[PDB]
């Protein structure tokens, strides 16, 4: 459930939050609208556990496998299963143009998967692109009956450290690994201005991923709805944006801001990027 | 309106938020149950005024001047009208036994008082406490129509500098201006276990002040309601806890965490404890 009474929680015994010592000295810890970023040591899982098992959280994710990416589901679950929301109740929606090809994996109790048949598109970007479509028809559909939140990844990943309720909120992005530390102007926003997705030089906050946002149902469906109404709208107008329904995610957020940022750690690349102080854990990562 | 569907904001031209740049490196920005503490330099006031004012934000204000209290009403409100909430619908409700001692006071636009009787009590500490249950009362009545945030503090007070939308959330508390630096074992809970404000030595975030809480008027009526019951059952057990309606807040704020903690700018007492370097601005001060 999300928004339903709240029961009191128990004594915990924790240590205690000291007003005059932050958790992070290096990093930006809170958006100036006042949204929480998510990096190691802001967060004591075992309130926030309590918190969202009081409420009988179900998170659902939602993963898209299609054509050769078939091949990464196996690692992508297996590790999930030791991962991500471990003690909540989890649905995996595996979206594939193979139903064959899903591997029969073993799940933990309180989680199920299911496989959601799709057609395959010929261009990867338009494939990546229609994410967006299918995501709000599911919506609609068993989504608002199903769970309570939404994570919506890619499936070229895999898990190698805790990835939990922490992340769970109306609305969140996650810090591109690539552009964390850029100025806006790099950021590689749209920036035709014959685009829907377009951002102008001076705008934006952070540049986000296409392959890691989520939120509540209502939310997510907002957000993919709005994303798929402006790629329709670029297609009928004959422009591709330039990262496709990543340039879309990124003007979506510039305009309705997430109410927490996930920090890179939430989606990192070792081989490109390697493994830079700042990060104290890399959660969820890039296959090779 | 709360958690209504929330328009498009607007292109805005400001400083990009800079990941590897904290706002605040001196205090704690974000609780550990990611909750934001509210300090000078972690909020764009222009981005959060636009959230605000796109769902027509209403804020209600309680306030209770009972017996020679209602002396401090010309300045609180006055004040009030140069710093609480500027642009935005604010309706004061000002609880007191002396009607006619109220000010007049001339407000801005989108901005009205009620004058709500009550009966006056002959102990503060009874005054003070009484609190909890008329707001909850007001609540049913009509808070719930009018308002969409409440915000309850003391009268006896001054704004100095800005309060804004900043504040607002579900349900905030607002760290005691005597307290922010203790450990929890020297902050003023109630003690005894026969209290139901009780909190064991091991326990607490925070000590919160009976002076300045608020939120959604939902999650207001429901601490002014836990608040009121866990008084009456002290009351028939013959125990009044050691701070009153504060020692059953602190309780409640304990259980319930709040989801956004503002920090001492937003009630201090200059004349007590000076203008530490810790406080950038002095926004809502006693009065000696
Ligand atoms: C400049 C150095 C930054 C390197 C990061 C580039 O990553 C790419 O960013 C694009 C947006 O400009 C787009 O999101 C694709 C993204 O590349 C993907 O993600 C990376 C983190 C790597 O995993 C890469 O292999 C993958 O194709
Ligand atoms: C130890 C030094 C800290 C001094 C702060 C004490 O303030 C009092 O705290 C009590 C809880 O222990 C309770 O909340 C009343 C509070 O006193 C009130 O608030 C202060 C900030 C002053 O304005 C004071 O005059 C007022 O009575
Ligand atoms: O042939 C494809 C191309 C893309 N995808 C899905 O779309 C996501 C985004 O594509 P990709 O991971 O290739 O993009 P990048 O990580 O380079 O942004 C993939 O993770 C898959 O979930 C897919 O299933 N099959
Ligand atoms: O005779 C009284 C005593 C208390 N109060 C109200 O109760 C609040 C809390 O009391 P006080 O400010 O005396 O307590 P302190 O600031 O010492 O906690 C006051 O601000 C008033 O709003 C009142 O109106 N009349
Ligand atoms: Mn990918
Ligand atoms: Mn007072």
Same mark, same amino acid.
């Given at each position: 459930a999300i928004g339903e009474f709240m029961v009191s929680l128990p004594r915990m015994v924790y240590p205690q939050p000291k007003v %005059?010592?932050?958790?992070?000295?290096?990093?930006?810890?809170?958006?100036?609208? %006042?949204?929480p970023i998510v990096?190691? #040591?802001?967060?004591?899982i075992d309130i926030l556990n309590e918190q969202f098992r009081l409420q009988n959280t179900t998170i659902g994710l939602t993963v898209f496998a299609i054509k050769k990416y078939v091949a990464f589901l196996k690692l992508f679950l297996e590790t999930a299963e030791k991962?991500?929301?471990?003690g909540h109740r989890v649905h995996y929606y595996v979206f594939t *143009?193979?139903?064959?090809?899903?591997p029969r994996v073993t799940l933990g109790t309180g989680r199920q998967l299911s496989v959601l048949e799709v057609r395959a598109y010929k261009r990867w970007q338009d494939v990546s692109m229609r994410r967006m479509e299918m995501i709000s028809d599911f919506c609609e559909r068993r989504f608002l009956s199903e769970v309570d939140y939404l994570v919506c990844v890619d499936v070229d990943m895999e898990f190698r450290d805790h990835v939990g309720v922490?992340?769970?909120?109306p609305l969140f992005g996650t810090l591109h690994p690539g552009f964390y530390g850029s100025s806006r102007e790099a950021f590689?926003?749209?920036?035709?201005?014959?685009?829907?997705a377009y951002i102008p030089? *001076?705008? #934006?906050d952070f540049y986000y991923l296409g392959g890691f946002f989520g939120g509540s149902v209502q939310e997510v469906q907002r957000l993919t709805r709005a994303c798929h109404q402006a790629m329709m709208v670029d297609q009928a107008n004959g422009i591709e944006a330039v990262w496709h329904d990543e340039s879309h995610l990124n003007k979506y957020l510039l305009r309705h801001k997430p109410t927490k940022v996930l920090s890179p750690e939430y989606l990192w690349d070792q081989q490109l %990027? #390697?493994?830079?102080?700042?990060?104290?854990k890399l959660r969820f990562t890039a296959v090779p």
């Open positions: %005059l010592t932050p958790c992070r000295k290096d990093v930006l810890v809170v958006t100036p609208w %006042l949204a990096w190691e #040591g802001t967060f004591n991962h991500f929301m471990v *143009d193979q139903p064959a090809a899903v922490e992340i769970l909120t590689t926003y749209e920036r035709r201005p014959q685009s829907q030089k *001076d705008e #934006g %990027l #390697g493994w830079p102080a700042v990060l104290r």
